[PDB]
Amino acid sequence: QYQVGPLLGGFGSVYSGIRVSDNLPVAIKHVEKDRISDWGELPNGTRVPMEVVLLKKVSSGFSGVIRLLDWFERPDSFVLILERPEPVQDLFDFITERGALQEELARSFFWQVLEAVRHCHNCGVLHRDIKDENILIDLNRGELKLIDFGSGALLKDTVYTDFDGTRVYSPPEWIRYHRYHGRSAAVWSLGILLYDMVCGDIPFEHDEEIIGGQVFFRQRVSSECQHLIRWCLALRPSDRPTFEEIQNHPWMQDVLLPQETAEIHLH
């Protein structure tokens, strides 16, 4: 039913693929049962990795999330069939190759990442690993897609005390106290991501810098943008903006549509 190409991607395994039934580009992701720590049960109650549970919850309708087309269980692994846009580049390679992004471009990207995380939250899913590496850019359509829910969880309003995401994007309350709330931790990670986009790299590498609450701009960044980043990176969780507050921020106004973004910046 699928024709398996070559590796696309570390310690993970995602292959290029084409569905024989219609030559749809697919990505085929393999996950070892030995390395799955979080398990769940589906709408019908079969015991599956949480990643599958969360992909299913976010994968209906159109969105800025890579959609799970199907999945199979094997003796020692699960296989996941996912969307594959073409042509594509992840946001980390794109920032490495092009450097600090122009603000107009960062704005279109960031806005779309906001819509995609809103969509996850609305569906009951916390990704917990928002970062340039987990964002694909469809270079023709100018659309971003979130990937890799392998560190995610069901969204809840109570405190989280576990976390297997990327440390340099984790908030100071996690570093200092081994606890966080979902949304407010998500917003912190989005402030790291925004800095990453407009400065060409993330702002912190060491714990002490994360907990330190000091944001140095290494590039010229407009002051409405600096203010949004600094707001998202408030040390105290309750001082961070809500998603609505991020999207109503003056830096966020007059966002380009995706085609426009593709035509102006990607083609």
């Binding site: 490495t96 690993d129 590496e133 990327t166 440390r167």
Partner: peptide
């Protein structure tokens, strides 16, 4: 100086 960071 710029690098990826695994989960």
């Amino acid at each position: 100086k710029r690098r990826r960071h695994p989960s």
